[PDB]
């Protein structure tokens, strides 16, 4: 059996500058020999090319979902952005039923959400689109409950989003701030119900301070040394008439973890974090499904991905291995399989334990040698058609923002890569060597401070097949087509990416 392997060097990309560039400063003679011998190109792993907004750096979850899917997998922010840009949003059934509930009960529409452009949990421009829809459908009373950010965006930036939003209310002639809460209170995720109950009480016009304007309460908070995230919830005088029977709520956050708790308070009948009388006849709508204990109408339902690489392998009676150390094990399993835990038929997996250290600069090789020794043991069985391997080190060590250890991490991975790839070539097989986004390519700012994040840089591709030319550009969704091409397996129509090998 001739194996084909995808080998993901996590957080390893192409960047022109050598300054703070561990990829370029490392001694990587195996990678370099493969790169000089075999066909090569580079592909995009950030922004629109992987289903993220323009200018947004790639990441492991979105990267491995795009790799495994063989298509661009649109993440929530972009999905919703595009729904707004092309009209479907204003047609959405769930939002229009929310509105029909209010219109038909002569009650109130409430909107909850993180009021920033952070884009991790929400985007405030989706609030504006909801205001427009409500206005088009003639709703009269819209109450906006602002949760302030300061965490995904500058720590004192709330006043500018509030200012713009107040102009939106005036421009559309609809909506008002009813309550204002730091995300500390409204978006807690550790079952600290005391914090939540403060946000609830302000939303509901029960117990809270009151100020005349959103600006005034935030400015008062700044004065006491409490920035955005930590603003004590408050009610806006004469602009809050409570959440009453018959009302509707639309929560525009798309990220589940920090939105679930507040939603359980309102719309989990079994909620017992503290005592409540829940609203009767409440239409509670969430932009996504936050958990299965919230009785909500879901605005953007999850889409299951059919025919990821692993499902195609299965349906061609191939065997596959997923292998990584702990830190990238969900990536090569769950995310690779399109957000599915269950193994495919003919799939087996190998988890290697990562070291238990606070930061991986303390052991730059991590468990890369044991991953490689596991993989060698597996290949010696001679029964694998497909391998998906991730070497975690460059991303996990690179996050430390320390150059010499990130270099050593890369050098450790290069030693393992030589052993893995030479064994595969020995077996008359093929490797695709690539990455899921950048990081170790830049671990220093231009002024030599630690830089600890991913990059937007494009990622290398090496395909270890002689006498073939790669396409000049492409994207992560092209990698699984390239695997199928190497395996001579037919590619189904719902994999819309394209093999990197030219024909």
Give the residue with the Cβ less far from Mn ion, 26 or 435.
435
Give percent helix, percent strand, percent coil of the chain, each to the nearest 5: 40, 15, 45
Rounded to a whole number of angstroms, the minimum distance from the CB of residue 8 to Mn ion is: 8
Of 167, 151, 80, 77, nearest to 116 by C-alpha is: 151
Which of positions 435-454 make contact with Mn ion (CB under 5 A)?
436
Give the residue with the Cβ less far from Mn ion, 10 or 264.
10
142, exposed or middle or buried, with CB in 10 Å at 0-12, 13-18, 19+?
A: buried
Contacts with 62 (C-beta within 8 Å, 6 or more apart), sequence order: 50, 51, 52, 73, 75
60 is catalytic: yes
Q: Which of 46, 60, 122, 354 is catalytic?
A: 60
Which backbone phi and psi does 91 adopt, to 5 degrees?
-95, -5
Was 328 annotated as part of a binding site?
Answer: yes
Q: What is the contact mask toward Mn ion in residues 403 to 442, using x (rule: CB under 5 A)?
A: ---------------------------------x------
Contacts with 151 (C-beta within 8 Å, 6 or more apart), sequence order: 118, 183, 228, 229
Indicate whether 325 belongs to the interface with Mn ion (CB under 5 A): no
Rounded to a whole number of angstroms, the minimum distance from the CB of residue 502 to Mn ion is: 28
Give the residue with the Cβ less far from Mn ion, 322 or 423.
322
Was 149 annotated as part of a binding site?
Answer: no
Q: What DSSP letter does each residue of 17-56 carry, written as one string?
A: --TT-HHHHS--HHHHHHHHHS-EEEEB-SGGGGTS-TT-
Was 145 annotated as part of a binding site?
Answer: no
Q: What is the contact mask toward Mn ion in residues 3 to 32, using x (rule: CB under 5 A)?
A: -------x----------------------
Indicate whether 395 belongs to the interface with Mn ion (CB under 5 A): yes
Question: Using the rule CB under 5 A, which residue among 46, 60, 400, 457 binds Mn ion?
Answer: 60
Query: Coil, strand or helix: which one is 352?
Result: strand
Counting residues that bind Mn ion (by CB under 5 A) gives 4
Q: Can you tell me which residue has the tokens 């409490």?
A: 226
Helix 368-379 / helix 403-426 crossing angle, nearest 10 deg: 10
Strand partners, 235: 179, 210
Was 349 annotated as part of a binding site?
Answer: no
Strand order in the sheet with 459-463: 40-43, 459-463, 430-434, 4-9, 386-391, 320-325, 347-352
- Rounded to whole angstroms, how far apart are CA atoms 446 and 450? 10
Rounded to a whole number of angstroms, the minimum distance from the CB of residue 437 to Mn ion is: 5
Was 121 annotated as part of a binding site?
Answer: yes
Indicate whether 228 belongs to the interface with Mn ion (CB under 5 A): no
- Rounded to whole angstroms, how far apart are CA atoms 28 and 8? 15
- State which residue has the least CB distance to Mn ion: 60
Contacts with 470 (C-beta within 8 Å, 6 or more apart), sequence order: 39, 40, 41, 461, 463, 500, 501, 502
Was 191 annotated as part of a binding site?
Answer: no
Was 405 annotated as part of a binding site?
Answer: no
Was 192 annotated as part of a binding site?
Answer: no
Known binding positions for substrate: 121, 151-152, 183, 189, 255-258, 328
Active site positions, annotated? 60
Show binding-site residues for (2R)-3-phosphoglycerate. Answer: 121, 151-152, 183, 189, 255, 258
Please enumerate, by residue number, every residue annotated as part of a binding site: 10, 60, 121, 151-152, 183, 189, 255-258, 328, 395, 399, 436-437, 454
Residues that bind Mn ion (CB under 5 A): 10, 60, 395, 436
């Amino acid at each position: 059996k001739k194996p084909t392997a995808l080998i993901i060097l996590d957080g390893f990309a192409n960047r022109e500058s050598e300054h703070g560039n561990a990829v370029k400063l490392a001694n990587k003679p195996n990678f370099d020999r493969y790169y000089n011998k075999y066909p090569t190109t580079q592909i995009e792993a950030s922004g629109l090319d992987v289903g993220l907004p323009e200018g947004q750096m790639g990441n492991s979850e979105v990267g491995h979902m795009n790799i495994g899917a063989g298509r661009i997998v649109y993440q929530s922010l972009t999905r919703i952005n595009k729904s707004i840009e092309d009209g479907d949003f204003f047609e959405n059934d769930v939002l229009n039923n929310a509105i029909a509930h209010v219109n038909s009960h002569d009650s109130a529409l409430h909107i909850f959400g993180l009021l920033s452009d952070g884009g991790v949990h929400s985007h405030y421009k989706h609030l504006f689109a909801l205001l427009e829809l409500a206005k088009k459908q003639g709703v009269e009373k819209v109450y906006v409950h602002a949760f302030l950010d300061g965490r995904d965006v500058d720590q004192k930036s709330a006043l500018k989003y509030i200012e713009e939003t107040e102009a939106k209310f005036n421009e559309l002639g609809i909506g008002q701030f009813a309550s204002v809460s730091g995300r500390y209170y409204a978006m807690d995720r550790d079952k600290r119900w005391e914090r939540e109950e403060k946000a609830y009480n302000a939303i509901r016009n029960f117990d809270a301070p009151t100020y005349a304007t959103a600006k005034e309460g935030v400015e008062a908070s700044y004065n006491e040394g409490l920035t955005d995230e930590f603003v004590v919830p408050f009610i806006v005088e004469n602009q809050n008439d409570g959440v009453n029977d018959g009302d509707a709520v639309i929560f525009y956050n798309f990220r589940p973890d920090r939105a679930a708790q507040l939603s359980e308070i309102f719309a989990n009948r079994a909620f017992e974090g503290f005592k409540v009388e829940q609203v009767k006849d409440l239409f509670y709508a969430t932009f996504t499904k936050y958990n299965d204990n919230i009785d909500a109408a879901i605005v953007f339902e999850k889409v299951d991905l059919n025919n990821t690489i692993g499902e195609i392998a299965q349906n061609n009676n191939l065997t596959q291995l997923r292998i990584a150390e702990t830190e990238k094990y969900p990536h090569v399993t769950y995310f690779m399989s399109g957000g599915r835990n269950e193994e495919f038929k003919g799939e087996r997996r190998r988890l290697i334990d990562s070291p238990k250290v606070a930061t991986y600069d303390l052991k730059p090789e991590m468990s890369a040698y044991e991953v490689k020794d596991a993989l060698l043991e597996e290949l010696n069985k001679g029964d694998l058609d497909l391998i998906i391997l991730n070497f975690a080190n460059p991303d996990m060590v690179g996050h430390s923002g320390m150059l010499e250890p990130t270099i050593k991490a890369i050098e450790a991975v290069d030693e393992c890569l030589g052993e893995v790839v030479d064994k595969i070539l020995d077996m008359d097989g093929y490797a695709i060597i690539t990455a899921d986004h950048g990081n170790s390519d830049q671990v220093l700012t231009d002024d030599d401070q630690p830089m600890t994040t991913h990059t937007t840089n494009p990622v290398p591709v090496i395909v270890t097949k002689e006498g073939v030319t790669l396409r000049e550009t492409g994207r992560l969704g092209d990698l699984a087509p390239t695997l199928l091409d190497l395996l001579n397996v037919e590619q189904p129509e719902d994999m819309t990416g394209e093999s990197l090998i030219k024909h």
